[PDB]
């Protein structure tokens with residue numbers, strides 16, 4: 001067989017989100033980004049001439065991005081935020097006693113500790129593998145999946161999993 | 164004399180901000196963008212060989228961007244937001260009764276009606292002309308100033324003023 | 327009022343097509359391109375804070391592109407091609423007696439003389455104005471529409487209409 | 490010694506071709522692309538200060554691209570196309586009985602099964618190594634050659650060989 | 653008739669040159685740039701379907717660039733440089749008594765006062781019109797020629813002539 | 816733990832320098848480039864949610880670039896240049912007896928043999944590790960550092976060190 005590595009990357013694989021960084025002894029102000037996601041994978045070229053169809057990769061990256069897009073990204077497991085449910089809002093209180101409140105529907109609660117590029121990348125990697133489907137990946141011989149997330153064109157984090 | 168048109172554009176001329184769109188009968192969710200600003204100008208080439216030094220354009224675009232960067236962009240003159248001062252926060256209430264609250268220091272209050280690309284462009288154009296200095300522009304023979312603001316690589320608004 | 331100029335441009339505004347150039351005393355070989363379309367317009371900023379919503383521009387550029395995408399572009403009005411209907415194919419004969427045949431369904435017949443970037447740009451401009459809708463443009467105060475078509479990143483043609 | 494990895498990539502390393510995808514139970518329509526080729530290699534920095542001269546890499550990528558450019562890409566080993574020689578044309582018949590005919594001189598017959606990005610990448614990799622010359626590569630200490638082919642900016646396949 | 657505007661722009665339209673800025677009361681250090689040139693023109697679409705063939709524009713931009721490429725750019729008409737011919741070198745003395753010497757063959761003497769982007773743009777515009785040929789432009793109905801020169805991706809000057 | 820790989824890359828990580836290539840039996844003319852530097856690193860995501868803060872990477876890449884920027888790059892260890900100190904200049908004599916002279920302050924003397932992209936990359940890699948600080952990198956768990964240097968957008972060299 002012949003190994004090939006596929007890359008899909010596009011201005012469409014975007015989610016335009018608000019967030020703020022907080023960790024021990026530090027809190028940044030609320031702001032936002034046009035995050036962008038690329039996906040790279042490795043498998044053998046199949047009898048149909050593809051490792052896996054690009055169209056499916058594009059469909060599923062778009063799907064995951066679309067869930068995050070146009071929301072405030074809210075970590076679930078942060079040790080430095082107090083996240084309160086107040087009526088139909090999340091009220092967030094930082095260690096410096098700064099306070100924020102957002103409609104719950106404007107927020108996407110993600111099982112991460114920090115809304116950093118790195119942790120968001122790991123989350124997306126796990127979601128992309130679920131959406132494309134792990135058994136389906138293995139039928140295509142895919143053995144490696146890698147996600148790059150950029151928070152702006154100049155700063156990216158890349159994570160992978162051997163499958 | 165010889166007319167020349169200068170363009171300065173860069174990933175540095177950025178402000179990474181949160182905002183949300185609201186106008187009559189419409190409210191989007193809180194989200195964010197890596198806004199980018201380019202500046203174009205026209206004047207005659209001076210005896211020193213420049214219309215105006217690129218370094219000054221870069222310094223001042225960076226300065227204006229830096230004031231907006233890492234904040235929630237809050238319009239001052241919106242007819243569809245109720246903006247309340249609560250302790251050290253701005254509490255914002257929309258026509259659909261959605262409610263937000265942010266530390267005032269996380270917000271940049273801008274004399275616009277909507278945090279649209281177009282209105283933000285007009286605001287930046289006016290600020291850039293103040294920062295570079297209008298009399299200084301006229302000493303360099305500059306007669307045209309134009310700002311492009313992008314909210315993402317695929318959507319830009321451009322405004323100008325004849326001076 | 328305040329004039330603003332909007333630009334929408336994206337790798338999505340694409341149509342990946344085959345074509346070949348033929349004009350008097352010249353015929354190139356069959357080949358293809360990832361054509362890309364940008365749209366620029368001018369109007370006044372409306373009470374909602376937009377000249378016109380970017381989402382509608384993106385929707386309609388995508389629509390026009392999608393009709394052309396994945397087809398052979400066939401001119402209707404060429405003076406140097408003999409275009410024959412043979413069963414469910416178009417058979418095309420050039421002045422040098424070169425012959426081609428394609429399934430009609432693989433072809434998009436366009437009311438142009440040459441599949442040049444310039445003529446394709448004029449065709450798209452006319453189609454985009456129909457799709458977005460001319461009366462709707464005038465309600466938004468749009469007075470200028472301009473299309474750029476690229477046949478590769480290094481060669482573009484731009485056409486406009488005052489409306 | 491010191492390992493270095495060289496990358497050459499450029500809008501010039503292009504071939505603007507028509508093709509169509511066909512494999513069992515599937516046929517797309519005729520269309521085209523601005524394919525782009527990048528080359529990456531690894532060797533030790535030589536006493537002249539280069540792993541290998543960039544100019545030679547650029548010359549040979551251009552050469553291989555130029556053979557494919559402005560042609561229909563025709564696979565030789567497809568199990569789902571019937572490729573007939575008719576006078577000075579290739580007549581191609583698909584499993585759904587769709588029929589195409591092209592002048593042979595407009596076609597480039599390539600020893601692949603599918604005109605997919607992956608198979609085209611393997612073909613180019615093999616050709617680039619022949620053109621630059623394998624013994625010449627080994628005199629420069631090059632031990633790794635890798636080709637990326639893009640069919641559009643958003644979809645790429647990458648193949649390599651250890652030499 | 654139909655007006656169209658053509659743009660050609662490419663990483664190939666490059667000249668990698670050394671220069672330094674000097675004007676009254678100012679001298680920068682010797683350094684260099686990958687200058688890039690784009691050309692924009694306006695004419696009517698001709699009976700062959702082109703305003704003018706892109707290939708000719710590309711050929712001639714490459715030609716002009718190639719004359720400047722890999723040289724020190726030496727102004728002829730500077731009021732602040734003393735340019736001496738010493739054996740087979742140019743010895744250049746600045747107002748601060750700084751001194752440089754280069755082989756004449758490493759230098760390209762250009763009829764400008766300052767090696768600024770603006771003056772280099774005017775020079776290239778004049779050369780491009782000579783190379784493509786003014787009478788030939790008028791046979792194609794071209795009435796406007798415009799050159800953009802960038803000294804780096806973030807700083808460009810644009811000059812034009814109505815013809 | 817979770818491995819992540821960070822990339823920082825930007826038009827700001829630039830140094831606009833003059834240089835010329837000389838090695839045995841070869842000398843190019845004086846010219847220049849907008850060199851660009853990217854940095855890639857690998858470590859584990861720390862309890863603060865970062866492998867290492869992007870801001871520190873950006874600060875230090877800028878610092879190293881800034882030392883080289885706006886100078887002639889002068890190798891220290893070339894076997895084919897005769898480098899003489901003459902008053903406040905370096906006079907450089909090549910094997911073909913070509914002669915150059917530059918103010919010492921316009922030159923940056925770098926401990927390399929050739930001003931090639933590869934050797935400049937190794938030098939920058941070593942400097943970046945010193946500037947960010949090796950012990951500080953190891954506190955962040957960083958185990959891999961990699962620098963890419965481009966002399967123009969189309970030609971790059973990449974070097975790394977396991978730490």
Ligand SMILES: Nc1nc2nccnc2c(=O)[nH]1
Nearest residue numbers: 116117865866867868869870
């Ligand atoms: N490593 C890293 N650094 C950062 N610095 C500032 C903002 N975000 C980030 C981020 O998400 N990751």
Ligand SMILES: Nc1nc2nccnc2c(=O)[nH]1
Nearest residue numbers: 279280376377378379380381
């Ligand atoms: N015209 C325009 N349209 C938009 N659509 C969605 C979000 N923002 C915008 C915006 O800022 N301007």
Ligand SMILES: Nc1nc2nccnc2c(=O)[nH]1
Nearest residue numbers: 442443702703704705706707
């Ligand atoms: N002006 C122009 N020139 C061209 N040259 C070659 C191929 N296509 C074209 C084209 O579409 N337009």
Ligand SMILES: Nc1nc2nccnc2c(=O)[nH]1
Nearest residue numbers: 050051052053054055605606
């Ligand atoms: N993997 C892969 N997928 C594709 N999907 C559509 C068209 N071409 C392709 C192609 O060439 N490769």
Ligand SMILES: Nc1nc2nccnc2c(=O)[nH]1
Nearest residue numbers: 213214215216217218768769
């Ligand atoms: N306007 C202008 N400004 C500059 N600043 C620094 C270096 N070059 C330039 C230049 O060429 N033009």
Ligand SMILES: Nc1nc2nccnc2c(=O)[nH]1
Nearest residue numbers: 539540541542543544931932
């Ligand atoms: N490999 C390599 N080749 C080159 N060719 C020309 C100029 N510089 C270079 C260079 O710096 N590296």
Ligand SMILES: [Zn+2]
Nearest residue numbers: 031032033151
């Ligand atoms: Zn952020």
Ligand SMILES: [Zn+2]
Nearest residue numbers: 194195196314
């Ligand atoms: Zn928005």
Ligand SMILES: [Zn+2]
Nearest residue numbers: 357358359477
């Ligand atoms: Zn073509």
Ligand SMILES: [Zn+2]
Nearest residue numbers: 520521522640
């Ligand atoms: Zn295709």
Ligand SMILES: [Zn+2]
Nearest residue numbers: 683684685803
């Ligand atoms: Zn310079």
Ligand SMILES: [Zn+2]
Nearest residue numbers: 846847848966
């Ligand atoms: Zn060089």
